Design an enzyme around this catalytic site. Structure first.
Site, PDB file in Angstrom:
ATOM      1  N   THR C 246     102.928 110.326  10.390  1.00  5.49           N
ATOM      2  CA  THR C 246     101.868 111.124  10.987  1.00  5.49           C
ATOM      3  C   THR C 246     102.358 112.558  11.102  1.00  5.49           C
ATOM      4  O   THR C 246     103.558 112.830  11.017  1.00  5.49           O
ATOM      5  CB  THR C 246     101.455 110.585  12.360  1.00  5.49           C
ATOM      6  OG1 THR C 246     100.541 111.500  12.977  1.00  5.49           O
ATOM      7  CG2 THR C 246     102.670 110.435  13.248  1.00  5.49           C
ATOM      8  N   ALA C 247     101.408 113.476  11.292  1.00  2.32           N
ATOM      9  CA  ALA C 247     101.763 114.885  11.419  1.00  2.32           C
ATOM     10  C   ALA C 247     102.657 115.121  12.630  1.00  2.32           C
ATOM     11  O   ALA C 247     103.645 115.859  12.547  1.00  2.32           O
ATOM     12  CB  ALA C 247     100.500 115.740  11.507  1.00  2.32           C
ATOM     13  N   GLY C 295     111.454 116.239  10.562  1.00  4.33           N
ATOM     14  CA  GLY C 295     110.962 117.377   9.816  1.00  4.33           C
ATOM     15  C   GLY C 295     109.454 117.461   9.762  1.00  4.33           C
ATOM     16  O   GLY C 295     108.798 116.693   9.053  1.00  4.33           O
ATOM     17  N   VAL C 296     108.894 118.399  10.520  1.00  5.68           N
ATOM     18  CA  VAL C 296     107.471 118.709  10.486  1.00  5.68           C
ATOM     19  C   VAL C 296     107.344 120.219  10.324  1.00  5.68           C
ATOM     20  O   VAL C 296     107.653 120.979  11.249  1.00  5.68           O
ATOM     21  CB  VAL C 296     106.725 118.204  11.733  1.00  5.68           C
ATOM     22  CG1 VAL C 296     107.429 118.622  13.023  1.00  5.68           C
ATOM     23  CG2 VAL C 296     105.288 118.700  11.723  1.00  5.68           C
ATOM     24  N   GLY C 297     106.928 120.657   9.140  1.00  2.00           N
ATOM     25  CA  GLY C 297     106.819 122.067   8.856  1.00  2.00           C
ATOM     26  C   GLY C 297     107.608 122.563   7.655  1.00  2.00           C
ATOM     27  O   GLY C 297     107.103 123.365   6.865  1.00  2.00           O
ATOM     28  N   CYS C 302     103.532 121.477   3.461  1.00  6.15           N
ATOM     29  CA  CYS C 302     103.126 121.577   4.854  1.00  6.15           C
ATOM     30  C   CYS C 302     102.683 122.998   5.178  1.00  6.15           C
ATOM     31  O   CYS C 302     103.320 123.974   4.772  1.00  6.15           O
ATOM     32  CB  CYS C 302     104.273 121.158   5.770  1.00  6.15           C
ATOM     33  SG  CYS C 302     103.796 120.896   7.486  1.00  6.15           S
TER      34      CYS C 302
HETATM   35  N1  5GP Z   1     101.435 118.755   7.829  1.00  6.15           N
HETATM   36  C1  5GP Z   1     101.478 118.297   6.576  1.00  6.15           C
HETATM   37  N2  5GP Z   1     102.617 117.795   6.099  1.00  6.15           N
HETATM   38  C2  5GP Z   1     102.506 117.377   4.829  1.00  6.15           C
HETATM   39  C3  5GP Z   1     101.368 117.414   3.998  1.00  6.15           C
HETATM   40  N3  5GP Z   1     101.663 116.889   2.753  1.00  6.15           N
HETATM   41  C4  5GP Z   1     102.962 116.546   2.844  1.00  6.15           C
HETATM   42  N4  5GP Z   1     103.510 116.818   4.073  1.00  6.15           N
HETATM   43  C5  5GP Z   1     104.902 116.586   4.504  1.00  6.15           C
HETATM   44  O1  5GP Z   1     105.766 117.247   3.606  1.00  6.15           O
HETATM   45  C6  5GP Z   1     106.628 116.285   2.948  1.00  6.15           C
HETATM   46  C7  5GP Z   1     106.883 116.716   1.526  1.00  6.15           C
HETATM   47  O2  5GP Z   1     107.366 118.049   1.470  1.00  6.15           O
HETATM   48  P1  5GP Z   1     108.594 118.431   0.533  1.00  6.15           P
HETATM   49  O3  5GP Z   1     109.677 117.447   0.909  1.00  6.15           O
HETATM   50  O4  5GP Z   1     108.072 118.207  -0.870  1.00  6.15           O
HETATM   51  O5  5GP Z   1     108.884 119.891   0.812  1.00  6.15           O
HETATM   52  C8  5GP Z   1     105.909 114.957   3.125  1.00  6.15           C
HETATM   53  O6  5GP Z   1     106.775 113.842   3.017  1.00  6.15           O
HETATM   54  C9  5GP Z   1     105.271 115.103   4.499  1.00  6.15           C
HETATM   55  O7  5GP Z   1     106.229 114.878   5.522  1.00  6.15           O
HETATM   56  C10 5GP Z   1     100.156 117.960   4.539  1.00  6.15           C
HETATM   57  O8  5GP Z   1      99.070 118.075   3.972  1.00  6.15           O
HETATM   58  N5  5GP Z   1     100.317 118.378   5.848  1.00  6.15           N
END
Ligand code: 5GP
Ligand code: 5GP
Ligand code: 5GP
Ligand code: 5GP
Ligand code: 5GP
Ligand code: 5GP
EC number: 1.7.1.7
Lengths: 467, 467, 467
Positions: C246-247, C295-297, C302
């Site tokens: 979840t977010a 990790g959120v952000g 994201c």
């Molecule tokens: N808040 C948000 N997080 C996202 C979204 N799509 C992916 N993420 C987060 O970003 C991660 C992927 O980012 P990356 O690791 O490619 O930089 C995902 O596993 C998830 O935790 C989105 O639409 N909104």
């Protein structure tokens, strides 16, 4: 043909070098003139699609045959494919166009690539012989390329039975979101798709049909090999008209081929070419040919002018050969050098019983080629020359012959972004010819030849008017 | 020459202003016509490489002589270099091309620059007279520019003895990774390199050879200075044909030079030019010249048209001079204004016994120049005019003469990215001439002149066909 | 974790703001270190493909599972598709990759589009379960787009039985024109395709398998709706690992979902996220979760950082949460902000038991998306965010919720022109992690965490080295 007083140029004239002087006219409208040909090929419009593998296919054959023009199948083609194409064309509705039938298990990529096979702009998803959906550029875009077409958000279609007059289907499509409408057989099976402009054209054009009321088609043979056997097998395959084509139509091999085909007594009209001389037309007529193709060099894919210096400006060759053939009772098909409807109008004015379009129709939706896209995303298609298919014929021998053989020239024929279908090119050509008839004041093509007066114009004379 | 009825233009015609009307033909294929010249120069194809220092070298000489055309060595050249070139050419295999021989101690830069000297695309690294390796654009790239060629990862080559028929070496090279194959002498020493397309051409073309069976070669002299001594020394040097060239071939100096050379009684055929008038050809023929060069101004490097207004359209000059020479029994070489094979075909059609290519062949692999590269990396070469070498002649006197002298014009002749060798240009020219023969229906060049019919065409007439 | 003396920055650090100081090392080579994870997810490499619909598919699942990393299936996916994907993955060879199987009746367009589904570069045309041909970018190009694949000039392939060691197939493919080789079942049916670099990787990586020796796979569920029923059905579907995403992973809904899943006693390891605080990890651990996503952000897709200002630099959050979880015995998965292998190495160094790649793997051949092409023809793919799939939840209600919902962000992840497959990205990541282990001197991931020393670097510190 009649020329203006004092017009005796010391050079053979092309289409850009001549013009038609309008005369006293009694033809009220363009629709008051008939474009039926006298050559016996039975084409209600003076348009023939060339025997080029890049311009002559089953789709173009059926479309132009429905619009009233004959199509010559390319030479050096496996008779199995010829028979398949002829059977396909002869089994087409005289009014309704055959759509892009899509099985529900086809992919999105296949549907998108097939959508441009026809000018309808929409494809029919049909299940168990019953139409169940319609796809277009809108619903197809955005979805995954390899998703099934059963999940492409099929749209609703206007369904009408086969036999409704074009008036009724026309008013049915006045406010339709999709221009096309599915003509269904009485049992409910899909029989075809008819369009708004297709409904319009169903009355203007009279389809070219044989004695059995089936879309006329033609096929071409070369001179290398047994011409008689190939021509006989082509006649048994169902081809209405036989065209014997070669780079040089005045050689002894051409005469022998025409003599053999005439001795076969197949009953189909005889077409031979190409000769740009009166004596060549006389020899072809005496060899047993009813129709003579004229023009070697003016072809937009022809290279022999630059490589060999041979050829002739198209208009003068056409008029001289037409005069010779009409002296001997034969008839003439102009071939090559057609890029504007004025070329068709002048070719018919010079005395040719018909004109043959060629690579201009290659830049259409229905041409048997791949609709590629340029960098600027403008649609276009690749047109190729016939090369050895129009030339008289181990690895050593093959490569030795190919070394001196003219390369297969390639050209980029751009698609009209709006009027890309061959229907609209035919509309432009027919409108131009009808307007030429009205300006001359001729009720038919023989009257066009009889009553036309042609003048000579310089380079700056061609600049007059809007391009 | 025969012209179409009503074609009496009030202007001299060039190649772009004329066309050949095909006639009744009995020649089946292009290979059924022979291109042997009647002028006595003994060239089996109607192609002569001009006496330009940018187009006439030992490599072009041997290549074109092996392909059946004579090459005129540039004038104002040290007789030592002339003798070296003649001895090199006369010591060449009639079938096998001389490759780029590479000593094992040569650098990578030298090998890469030498690889483009010939059209084979590969160079032979030979040690002690025995071929030990092959280099190309692949293995050479990436390695250090000044590494030795003994460490350039030499590839394997197909080795065959000298005397194997082109069939056997052709099938030997069907699946060869490298197109070329080394023809080795019976003792094992390298004798030459033969290519797949070279094997193909070994049968189509018959090499031009003298009475001793050696590749024919020609050389040129001016009119300034002792013409007799230079011509005699050239004849003793081994040159088969003598060409006396000047900007104006109708001056008294030209006549005196021809008279002196004829009085020398060297036995070689006499070539003089250039004259674009019937009276000039008559004077040259009476002066003791068997062959007359025609054309001053149409040359792609010639500037006199823009600077002086003198000259003549090439086709009309060629036909008039050919008529005059055939009246007096002499023979004609068209010179200048050749850019397409149609130019060659029309020059031979006008009545010229031969045509001379000029700067078109400068854009080839074998031209004696430096293969430079443009910004877009398209290969090309610089073609220069002869200038004072074709003109009649202290620091003050030198600079005073040079001030009024026409500058050495420079042009950029682009290489064909695929068919860059002079072999392929010769193939194109010969294919065009053979096709012209078939369209006319002529079995030989005299029949080409006799049976050709030429018409006049306007500016728009040249636009017909694929460029 | 250990830090350099005097390094107490007054700000949370990201990956670009930290570096690893090498210590006394006894690990000789990169191959001397094992990357097996301790978290219980059973991945032999510390790489997890994110639960994103643009990066998590059946092909990526099977590939990464064969290479030793687990893949989390995207949330909000029909359990029918989940079961199909799980059954497909569990029925894959532990060594051989599943190729692009092509039926002989497929079109050329479908074959060309399918060729880029896998990194092999070639597709297998199989008839009646028996491999009969191979297609690639070479033979497919030039032919008509809608010709059947039975007429695409099928090439020859190297056939080997299943069970041959990678050594034998490797030497079999040393000089093979096509890099791939068909591993066939003993009965003759096609079982898979193995590549030269695939043969290389078959020994370096140990595939991640469950207790039954089948490729491990994972799936994700949200918090909206009945979490317990969805998790139970997912467990019965065959998913090895459950991820609840979840977010905001610190809300009461997250805790309730984890409590329900833990009370279900499914036996699979528990994964929850995302929390970037020690208290959030404590709450998640006490809620019945064994593994915590952090990790959120930082996620490349994201947006919440720019829209809301919430988030945390990834490295500091990862290290703090890892310290908290190791205090409570739990384990940590870093998520988001991974663009270079240094990010993976630092995430593992900070104390995370695993890292999760995300949108970086979306720019691969095996990602479940459409391989589009840009204007410069550079290959790339579109990566989308999860958006409402990671957020807690009539036409009015739907549109009202969608108005305030964060839009589905889109990014263009470019394909490597040579090393475009996810195999090569995994190779780069694993090489970087192994080199980090050697520089630290750690024989395993726990030793990596124990013996790593991290320093702080400024903006100019990141400029050191080759980009
Ligand atoms: N808040 C948000 N997080 C996202 C979204 N799509 C992916 N993420 C987060 O970003 C991660 C992927 O980012 P990356 O690791 O490619 O930089 C995902 O596993 C998830 O935790 C989105 O639409 N909104
Ligand atoms: N599925 C499908 N393919 C079609 C249809 N019309 C043409 N094609 C494709 O186009 C090919 C022939 O192209 P043509 O020679 O008609 O331009 C067929 O073999 C088929 O692949 C149609 O209605 N449905
Ligand atoms: N010599 C020659 N003529 C060709 C070739 N391809 C087509 N043609 C001629 O040119 C005609 C088509 O030209 P268009 O009418 O499109 O300008 C054909 O019907 C045929 O007569 C080719 O490769 N060589
Ligand atoms: N080493 C080497 N140089 C060659 C060869 N052929 C031509 N050259 C170079 O090219 C020069 C002459 O150029 P050309 O006048 O033949 O175009 C020679 O003096 C030499 O530098 C060859 O086979 N081997
Ligand atoms: N007047 C003049 N003629 C030249 C010069 N260079 C070459 N030519 C002429 O032009 C011919 C070559 O021209 P091309 O045949 O390539 O068009 C030569 O054979 C020669 O007759 C020059 O500098 N001045
Ligand atoms: N014919 C064929 N299609 C395949 C193959 N692998 C994937 N596809 C296509 O790709 C779709 C699924 O894409 P994915 O989710 O695997 O990226 C399938 O439904 C099918 O259209 C294969 O081996 N053969």
């Amino acid at each position: 043909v009649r020329f203006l007083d004092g017009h005796t140029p010391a050079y053979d004239l092309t289409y850009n070098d001549v013009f038609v002087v309008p005369g006293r006219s009694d033809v009220a409208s363009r629709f008051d003139v008939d474009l039926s040909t006298v050559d016996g090929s039975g084409t209600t419009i003076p348009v023939v699609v060339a025997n080029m593998t890049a311009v002559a296919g089953r789709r173009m054959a059926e479309t132009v045959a429905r619009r009233g023009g004959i199509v010559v199948l390319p030479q050096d083609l496996p008779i199995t494919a010829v028979s398949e194409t002829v059977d396909f064309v002869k089994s087409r509705d005289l009014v309704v166009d055959t759509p892009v039938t899509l099985s529900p298990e086809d992919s999105v990529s296949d549907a998108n690539a097939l959508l441009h096979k026809r000018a309808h702009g929409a494809a029919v998803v049909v299940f168990e012989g019953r139409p169940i959906g319609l796809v277009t550029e809108a619903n197809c875009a955005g979805v995954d390329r390899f998703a099934r077409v059963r999940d492409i958000a099929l749209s609703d279609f206007v369904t009408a039975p086969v036999g409704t007059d074009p008036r009724e289907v026309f008013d049915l499509l006045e406010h339709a979101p999709i221009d096309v409408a599915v003509m269904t057989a009485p049992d409910g099976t899909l029989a075809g798709v008819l369009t708004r402009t297709g409904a319009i054209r169903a009355g203007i054009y009279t389809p070219a049909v044989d004695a059995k009321g089936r879309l006329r088609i033609a096929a071409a043979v070369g001179i290398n090999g047994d011409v008689g056997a190939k021509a006989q097998a082509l006649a048994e395959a169902g081809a209405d008209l036989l065209v014997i084509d070669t780079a040089h139509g005045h050689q002894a091999k051409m005469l022998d081929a025409i003599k053999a085909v005439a001795s076969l007594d197949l009953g189909l009209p005889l077409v031979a070419g190409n000769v740009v001389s009166a004596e060549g037309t006389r020899d072809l007529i005496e060899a047993g040919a009813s129709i003579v193709k004229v023009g070697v060099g003016p072809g937009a894919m022809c290279t022999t002018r630059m490589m060999t210096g041979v050829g002739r400006p198209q208009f003068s060759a056409v008029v001289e050969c037409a005069a010779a053939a009409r002296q001997l009772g034969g008839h003439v098909w102009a071939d090559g050098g057609v890029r504007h409807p004025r070329d068709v109008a002048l070719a018919l004015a010079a005395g040719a019983s018909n004109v043959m379009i060629g690579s201009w129709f290659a830049g259409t939706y229905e041409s048997p080629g791949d609709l590629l896209f340029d960098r600027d995303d403008r649609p276009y298609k690749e047109s190729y020359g016939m090369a050895s298919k129009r030339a008289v014929a181990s690895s050593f021998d093959r490569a030795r012959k190919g070394l001196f053989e003219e390369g297969i020239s390639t050209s980029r024929m751009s698609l009209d972004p709006a009027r890309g279908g061959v229907e609209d090119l035919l509309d432009h050509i027919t409108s131009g010819v009808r307007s030429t008839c009205t300006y001359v004041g001729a009720a038919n093509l023989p009257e066009l030849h009889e009553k036309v007066v042609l003048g000579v114009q310089s380079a700056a004379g061609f600049a007059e008017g809007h391009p």
